[PDB]
């Protein structure tokens with residue numbers, strides 16, 4: 001109920017900020033994870049006879065679905081998408097966790113150099129954090145450069161639980177998914193924010 | 195888009211009728227489907243190395259999760275969730291399930307509870323702006339329901355199924371009260 | 385104020401599963417042929433009509449909504465619920481006048497000759513009642529009359545004690561659904577918005 | 582029998598209320614349709630009307646105990662209660678009504694005392710307080726009120742402050758706090 005009410009509130013808040021809520025399938029492609037360090041293939045919840053099926057595993061991250069939606073969007077530089085959803089993980093060796101993903105897509109002039117950056121995403125994230133009554137001074141923030149992120153921040157409790165990751169998707173990953181304009185991605189560990 | 199708002203409107207309406215929302219794992223046990231006809235074992239989306247763990251497949255039906263929840267805890271539960279089907283042989287579909295507990299199972303002296311359950315479903319349909327007159331209602335008793343109604347389009351597409359869960363099924367789940375179960379094919383209703 | 389209330393009523397209707405529609409004010413004079421409720425002689429005719437289908441300004445919202453229902457046919461199992469705010473025009477120094485209306489259209493069952501309109505007027509009555517409440521209108525001040533004409537098989541009128549029409553709503557005639565290629569029943573309300581202010 | 586049980590609990594509650602200073606009142610089941618003219622909460626359309634209603638002062642069955650209690654208040658800090666059948670289109674439902682009438686100096690009236698009496702009735706009846714859903718209400722009867730429902734949504738009680746208008750109609754001054762408990766539903 002706490003989750004459900006707070007999900008509703010976070011959604012209303014994000015829609016009020018011009019976000020669109022998306023829904024992607026939990027069924028996904030194992031190949032997306034081939035070679036990955038942050039979401040390794042060995043931790044995929046694989047399905048039976050996976051050679052004979054295109055969708056052959058359960059998603060370990062929301063990220064790839066979001067990239068598919070962006071790539072497929074008729075209007076694809078002003079996109080703000082969010083998705084609440086279960087992800088799946090193999091080490092009970094199997095686990096199901098609930099995530100909130102955010103996707104924000106993004107001139108010449110001196111006057112208008114102050115506009116599209118990761119910081120607009122960080123603001124969205126902070127505002128979610130404040131709406132959940134998170135103590136901002138408790139947070140331990142670290143740095144990440146990834147197979148998914150060229151740069152990004154990790155956000156942990158003083159106790160060590162991962163609360164969030166957010167940053168700038170590598171251009172390579174964007175090329176892989178047929179997306180041209182910059183993408184800022186946040187993965188919020190929803191259970192840990194209660 | 196329209197789905198999200200309606201889910202919310204339906205969740206609120208159900209809470210107002212004293213329902214509590216539940217969330218069950220999409221990972222489940224193939225053994226639940228053993229010898230079922232309505233949700234055949236052969237249509238289960240099994241996991242790779244199914245012997246490696248207790249959880250060994252994706253759910254085909256929301257039903258069993260709800261029975262587990264009833265057997266865990268007069269209950270009224272609802273759940274929005276994906277189910278998974280093996281026929282790209284692997285698909286996912288979105289369902290709304292309702293569980294309503296009734297009287298203790300006894301040998302003492304089902305019609306009237308199906309019609310209480312039907313009232314909740316009607317009110318869901320109205321909230322979805324559905325044309326009640328366009329529906330075709332059928333009778334059903336199977337391995338899931340001793341007594342149930344099916345709701346089809348005039349073309350014969352299934353939109354909902356609801357009724358009384360078999361005593362055998364109740365027994366399989368250590369459930370001691372009668373259970374009234376609805377499964378709404380939510381995507382089909384959009 | 386009118387603007388504030390229009391927004392409030394729109395939000396309420398959208399909340400109830402309505403979609404707002406917008407239809408052209410330029411329309412077809414032949415729709416009004418032989419009508420008594422909106423007579424052909426009271427139409428505001430164009431000096432330079434574009435065609436037989438575009439030769440006058442609308443006298444009623446009704447017809448545009450029936451066109452919209454016709455164009456919104458679906459294979460889904462859902463009622464269409466539409467509303468529209470718009471001006472209508474009347475010919476009677478200044479013979480041409482305009483007034484502002486809110487129309488509501490709600491579709492029902494497929495037209496059939498099967499056994500079993502009373503319950504339809506009662507369902508539409510609720511949306512109208514809640515609009516009135518939203519406008520702070522005092523229900524017990526209103527006088528409700530019965531009506532049957534070329535538009536409605538069965539209808540209610542809502543009037544002030546003085547006899548001023550505030551709303552009309554009911555079941556659209558079968559003949560009219562047919563003439564518009566609409567194959568579901570239609571419950572239609574016309575609220576005279578300015579009079580509600 | 583069920584009626585034997587209702588009778589016993591009715592007596593326990595009546596003794597408890599009397600002990601607390603209430604007087605039991607009894608009013609006619611026959612009433613005036615005029616009372617219900619224009620009401621939303623108890624619609625005129627739902628009265629069990631008697632034949633030739635224009636030719637009888639008392640021309641219908643009561644839907645609510647409220648009006649008889651207001652008549653009783655006029656005719657006498659009062660505390661009144663009444664058990665009695667109500668009628669509407671078909672239902673006969675037994676109800677319990679409670680009426681309580683009501684400084685400004687810092688050292689030293691409201692609905693809170695009425696709530697306490699209601700809560701004490703719920704407890705006498707073994708009703709689990711923690712399963713109850715409370716809502717707000719404002720209408721032609723109450724300027725402010727709480728509604729009390731079961732989890733599933735069945736109305737068990739309504740209690741609050743009667744509108745000054747309603748009280749004006751029955752020649753009643755000051756404040757009246759009124760509770761209507763759906764006795765049948767509490768059995």
Ligand SMILES: [Mg+2]
Nearest residue numbers: 597600601602
């Ligand atoms: Mg006392």
